[PDB]
């Protein structure tokens, strides 16, 4: 059960863009710095970087004590925008080995850490300890390969995917820089993780599918929705104007759908003009909202939309989503044939063209039929047990190498 | 608006020094290390005790996200990191593809982008 942050469940801006153009899309969890217009980090010259020790302690103890207060057991403290900031709590880092995995969490969402044993047989002690996560005790594999006897496995486990981590040391060198319009901020950060390759669980919709176009008439129903609950004019009213500018790639009449049914536009003397909330119309709540779309369902789209501009750029048109290499890396394909698999459905290529990292440590998720057929499953589990040990092997190493000089 | 996120990397020798500052947690960090990011974008320098050391800001090839806890168990993105700065002993303070990271942070992703990065096809 993995419960968001209510920024991230309510679906705000910016953590859940409305949209993102061609520029957007390439740079997609990749945020370059942006020079301040304003504000203290606008200005020329040195600026400070300020400690958050005393901050950081100061605001675990108040945590606590609100923990202590209600008055003991779980609390959630993840409630608004300030609450995410890295400013404060226990921090980690992890690094994705895949340039663009096919699933992406936002930020304001949650994971979970699962730390999978394999007992030894006959009297086993229990597992290792490790600092981060919970862990399960697994008679059958989670992954394409198996755990051995005595093997921890530790892993990032939510509703979109489950990957395998490793736990590595940060650099002496290296310091954690937050930036703000306001200052920097600095803090140590000695826990960062390698994510090795996503076993998807959540499946990503193809360009122009029904479900993508469920999905942002859904999305653009929930923004407008909010936007009349955002309004303190009675009777509520927005402005078509505001939802143009969120939905850029929107035609007005497309728009017009949306507000038809809740809503009557009302004229008047001057190029702005309302659609004002129909009183007998109910609007919905808080809770019924968010059941419309989820922190999920966003990311899935955002998957899509990503890999389908770099397709674009790398030449590939509509009409090639018999098919083209670069087409079967796309997270559509590679989750719906990861997926199928997972249920018995289908097998896996597993050494093939869609393998991420180009060189035989990762899985390529295109699907072959279940189609000497125990020989033909023996022989898929071989070759996925094979990658398994692999990635698990080379990504947890700490050997150095040695930069390659071509 | 989003929180703004990044590493900072000093020469060993300057680490230490901040490192230890950054433990004591003494407010006065604020004026022995500072930031200062020049117009291009892409060069600066960064202050450690007043001493100014050349600075490059740097793409890096892997995507990382900062996550915070309060359980050590639920864990909360924060912010994606996808950019270094890069403080060196040398270099022009002033300076008049050389900003493309090639390695991951963490030793196994060494020579990500030419070892393990499945490269794009085009056509």
Same mark, same amino acid.
Request: one cysteine or more.
């Given at each position: 059960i993995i419960q968001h942050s209510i920024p991230a469940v309510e679906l705000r801006q910016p953590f859940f863009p409305t949209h993102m153009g061609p520029i957007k899309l390439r740079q997609f969890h990749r945020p370059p710095l942006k020079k301040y217009? %304003?504000? =203290?980090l606008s200005q020329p010259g040195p600026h400070s970087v300020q400690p958050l020790l005393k901050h950081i302690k100061k605001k675990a103890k108040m945590r606590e004590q609100? $923990? *202590?207060?209600?008055?003991?057991?779980? @609390?959630?403290? @993840? !409630?608004?925008? *300030?609450?995410?900031?890295?400013?404060d709590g226990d921090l980690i880092l992890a690094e994705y080995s895949e340039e663009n995995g096919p699933l992406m969490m936002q930020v304001g969402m949650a994971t979970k850490i699962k730390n999978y044993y394999k007992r030894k047989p006959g009297k086993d002690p229990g597992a290792p300890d490790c600092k981060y996560g919970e862990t399960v005790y697994c008679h059958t594999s989670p992954f394409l390969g198996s755990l051995h006897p005595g093997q921890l496995l530790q892993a990032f486990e939510n509703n979109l995917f489950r990957a395998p981590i490793?736990?590595?040391?940060?650099?002496?060198?290296? %310091?954690?820089?937050?930036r703000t319009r306001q200052g920097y901020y600095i803090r140590e950060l000695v826990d960062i993780f390698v994510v090795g390759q996503q076993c998807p669980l959540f499946e990503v919709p193809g360009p122009n599918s029904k479900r993508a176009n469920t999905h942002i008439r859904d999305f653009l129903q929930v923004f407008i929705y909010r936007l009349f609950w955002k309004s303190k004019d009675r009777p509520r009213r927005i402005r078509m104007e505001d939802i143009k500018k969120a939905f850029p790639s929107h035609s007005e009449s497309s728009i017009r759908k949306r507000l038809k049914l809740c809503a009557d536009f009302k004229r008047t003397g001057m190029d702005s003009n309302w659609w004002?909330? +129909? #009183?007998?119309? !109910?609007?919905?709540?808080?809770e019924e909202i968010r059941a419309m779309v989820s922190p999920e369902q966003c990311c &899935?789209?955002? #998957? @899509?939309?990503? =890999?389908? *501009? !770099?397709?674009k750029d790398?030449?590939?048109?509509? +009409? #090639?989503? +018999?098919?083209?290499?670069?087409? !079967?890396? =796309?997270?559509?394909?590679?989750? $719906? &044939?990861?997926?199928? =698999?997972?249920?018995?459905?289908?097998?896996?290529?597993?050494?093939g063209v869609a393998?991420?990292?180009g060189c035989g440590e990762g899985f390529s998720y295109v699907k072959i039929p279940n189609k000497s057929v125990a020989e033909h499953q023996e022989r898929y589990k071989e070759e996925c047990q094979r990658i398994f040990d692999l990635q698990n092997k080379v990504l947890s190493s700490t050997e150095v190498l040695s930069t390659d000089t071509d | 608006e989003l929180e703004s996120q990044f590493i900072l990397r000093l020469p060993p020798e300057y680490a230490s020094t901040v490192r230890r500052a950054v433990q004591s947690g003494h407010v006065n960090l604020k004026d022995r290390l500072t930031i200062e990011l020049h117009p291009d974008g892409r060069h600066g320098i960064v202050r450690v005790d007043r001493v100014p050391l050349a600075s490059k800001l740097v793409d890096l090839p892997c995507v990382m996200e900062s996550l915070k806890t309060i359980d050590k168990k639920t864990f909360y993105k924060t912010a994606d990191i996808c950019q270094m700065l890069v403080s060196t002993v040398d270099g022009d303070l002033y300076?008049?593809?050389?900003?493309?990271?090639?390695?991951?942070?963490?030793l196994p992703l060494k020579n990500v982008r030419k070892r393990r990065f499945r490269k794009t096809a085009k056509k």
């Open positions: 217009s %304003f504000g =203290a609100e $923990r *202590q207060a209600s008055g003991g057991g779980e @609390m959630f403290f @993840m !409630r608004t925008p *300030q609450d995410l900031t890295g400013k490793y736990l590595h040391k940060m650099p002496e060198t290296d %310091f954690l820089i937050i004002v909330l +129909k #009183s007998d119309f !109910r609007l919905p709540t808080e &899935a789209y955002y #998957s @899509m939309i990503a =890999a389908e *501009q !770099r397709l790398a030449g590939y048109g509509e +009409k #090639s989503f +018999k098919i083209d290499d670069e087409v !079967r890396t =796309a997270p559509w394909n590679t989750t $719906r &044939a990861f997926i199928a =698999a997972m249920k018995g459905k289908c097998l896996l290529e597993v050494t393998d991420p990292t | 300076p008049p593809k050389k900003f493309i990271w090639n390695h991951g942070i963490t």
